[PDB]
Amino acid sequence: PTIFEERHLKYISQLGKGNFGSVELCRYDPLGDNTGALVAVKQLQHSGPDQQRDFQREIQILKALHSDFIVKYRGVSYGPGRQSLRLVMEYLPSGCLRDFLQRHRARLDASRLLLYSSQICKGMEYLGSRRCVHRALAARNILVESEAHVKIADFGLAKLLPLDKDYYVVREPGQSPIFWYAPESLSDNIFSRQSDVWSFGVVLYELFTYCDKSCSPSAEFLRMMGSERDVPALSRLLELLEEGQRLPAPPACPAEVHELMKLCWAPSPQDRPSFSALGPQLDMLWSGSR
Ligand SMILES: C[C@@H]1CCCC[C@@H]1n1c(-c2ccc(/C=C(/C#N)C(=O)N(C)C)o2)nc2cnc3[nH]ccc3c21
Ligand SMILES: NC(=O)Nc1ccccc1
């Protein structure tokens, strides 16, 4: 059931492009009559050994996860030849949360944003119990299953912590979404479940601004970086964060949610709340808003 025959996967279109991979909308059509199920299928391009190995990892992690708040693994496929591997996932046609929020802002109220917040937190709690660091977490990689149900996706950078270590360190990445990363990740290449909490804070910011491009993290940075313009962004961001500067409270954001953001952005990773501590608070806020 989890082995899709490659010759029966029919390409329709591209859903996402990464540095080394893409996610493609396909039909699995073993009857050949175009009646099969639609699936989302990841494969690599421009991939060396490291990228192949990371993709094997991604598959094993996602296959093991069973949460209502994590995109469903379906199976794998292999073509003929070297570098044949494909990851088959459920397809969610409503697309990503980032696009969904911008399209439907005028009808998605604070209660609904609280619901999405709580669901994403529950998915991160699930990951944490499996010692998985997601790293990529952002509104652009969270999927909308229905208007009242979201799921975490893009496990391309996900990694399991060793049983006896609560962080990992990588070599300097070439291309990072710098405005989502914890300072220890930006400066020392350290990632953990605590750096995931920082990113979740930025997700809460994305939710409560409806991903408006006028107040995106990059826009706020360009406003707050100061009058000196030709300064490298990463350098300057690290200085602003060290000085204690943070993204502003969105006008429509409940004060209690802004306070949770601030705690997610504590300087010291050990001072940030766990997802297990955040969950109850978001659950109480959501349930009080129904
Ligand atoms: C979000 C996930 C994970 C990242 C790659 C795209 C992917 N993805 C998407 C999808 C298409 C576009 C976007 C989001 C973007 C934003 N912002 C974007 O890429 N832009 C604007 C260029 O996300 N739709 C998917 C339906 N089913 C899927 N199943 C597994 C995965 C999956 C689907
Ligand atoms: N976490 C946080 O506040 N990050 C940030 C701060 C200033 C500009 C852009 C991003």
Curated annotation (Swiss-Prot):
Changing residue 97 to S: In T(-)B(+)NK(-) SCID. Residues 9-290 form the Protein kinase domain. It is linked to Severe combined immunodeficiency autosomal recessive T-cell-negative/B-cell-positive/NK-cell-negative: A form of severe combined immunodeficiency (SCID), a genetically and clinically heterogeneous group of rare congenital disorders characterized by impairment of both humoral and cell-mediated immunity, leukopenia, and low or absent antibody levels. Patients present in infancy recurrent, persistent infections by opportunistic organisms. The common characteristic of all types of SCID is absence of T-cell-mediated cellular immunity due to a defect in T-cell development. Interacts with STAM2 and MYO18A. Interacts with SHB. Interacts with CD69. It comes from Homo sapiens. The gene is JAK3. The active site is at 136 (proton acceptor). Tyrosine phosphorylated in response to IL-2 and IL-4. Dephosphorylation of Tyr-167 and Tyr-168 by PTPN2 negatively regulates cytokine-mediated signaling. Changing residue 126 to F: About 80% loss of STAT5a activation. It is found in: Endomembrane system; Cytoplasm. In NK cells and an NK-like cell line but not in resting T-cells or in other tissues. The S-form is more commonly seen in hematopoietic lines, whereas the B-form is detected in cells both of hematopoietic and epithelial origins. The modification Phosphotyrosine is found at residues 91, 126, 167-168. Possesses two phosphotransferase domains. The second one probably contains the catalytic domain, while the presence of slight differences suggest a different role for domain 1. The chain holds residues 814 to 1103 of 1124 of the full protein. Non-receptor tyrosine kinase involved in various processes such as cell growth, development, or differentiation. Mediates essential signaling events in both innate and adaptive immunity and plays a crucial role in hematopoiesis during T-cells development. In the cytoplasm, plays a pivotal role in signal transduction via its association with type I receptors sharing the common subunit gamma such as IL2R, IL4R, IL7R, IL9R, IL15R and IL21R. This is Tyrosine-protein kinase JAK3. Signal peptide: none annotated. ATP binds at residues 15-23, 42. Belongs to the protein kinase superfamily. Tyr protein kinase family. JAK subfamily.
